[PDB]
């Protein structure tokens, strides 16, 4: 199908909150092999974040219940939701590895690296045995790559740079049990954004300040 058709259909789905339809559109677009526009990048991001978001939410409820036929029912329901979660993550991580990251021609890089970090972090939330160590290392490596590029190429107020720090902070806190590092990374990103608030443009303003608020909320929670 035509890129333009798929993109218009994705935008319709987004408004309708039909994220499975939305992600199906954006998977097909990405698979055409051309670089995504900024608009298409956000479409992809929103669609997959809500598709996996649903499973994340459900998984947290059911595993909390498991932690309290029998307990078995919960366990089996948890495992089915897990399967779904992982297949969504595995799709995203395949799209990033097969198309998006290799053809990102601008500092796009990032994002897709951030995204790679996030979907591996979502796998790490649920990973149990053999492969968890590898999953967590992939998540760390992608975030670090993205982090290093972002420091070279973007102001400290740039929305994708702040969003990356935020998520990387959460990775350190939640996946790597590294609350010192999480707080230091959050605090630095926040303070550097403040110091250089004069660099924040009108078109980025609202997003960057919302992420700044989120950095501040986590820092509060982690020090509380």
């Amino acid at each position: 199908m035509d890129k333009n058709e798929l993109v218009q259909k994705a935008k319709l789905a987004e408004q309708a909150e039909r994220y499975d339809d939305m992600a199906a559109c954006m998977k097909s677009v990405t698979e055409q092999g051309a670089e995504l526009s900024n608009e298409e990048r956000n479409l992809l991001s929103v669609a997959y974040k809500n598709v996996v978001g649903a499973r994340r939410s459900s998984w947290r409820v059911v595993s909390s219940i498991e932690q309290k036929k029998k307990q078995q029912m919960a366990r089996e329901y948890r495992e089915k939701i897990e399967t779904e979660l992982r297949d969504i993550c595995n799709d995203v991580l395949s799209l990033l590895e097969k198309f998006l990251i290799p053809n990102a021609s601008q500092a796009s890089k990032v994002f897709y690296l951030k995204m790679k970090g996030d979907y591996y972090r979502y796998l790490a939330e649920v990973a149990a045995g053999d492969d968890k160590k590898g999953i967590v290392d992939q998540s760390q490596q992608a975030y670090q790559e993205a982090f290093e590029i972002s420091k070279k190429e973007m102001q400290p107020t740039h929305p994708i740079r702040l969003g990356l720090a935020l998520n990387f902070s959460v990775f350190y806190y939640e996946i790597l049990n590294s609350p010192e590092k999480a707080c230091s990374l959050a605090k630095t990103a926040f303070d550097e954004a403040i110091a250089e608030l004069d660099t924040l443009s009108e078109e980025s303003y609202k997003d960057s300040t919302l992420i700044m608020q989120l950095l501040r909320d986590n820092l509060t929670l982690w020090t509380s």
Partner: peptide
């Protein structure tokens, strides 16, 4: 008590 992460779009 779970922390916040970044919004989907930039």
């Amino acid at each position: 008590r779970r922390p916040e992460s970044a919004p989907a779009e930039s």
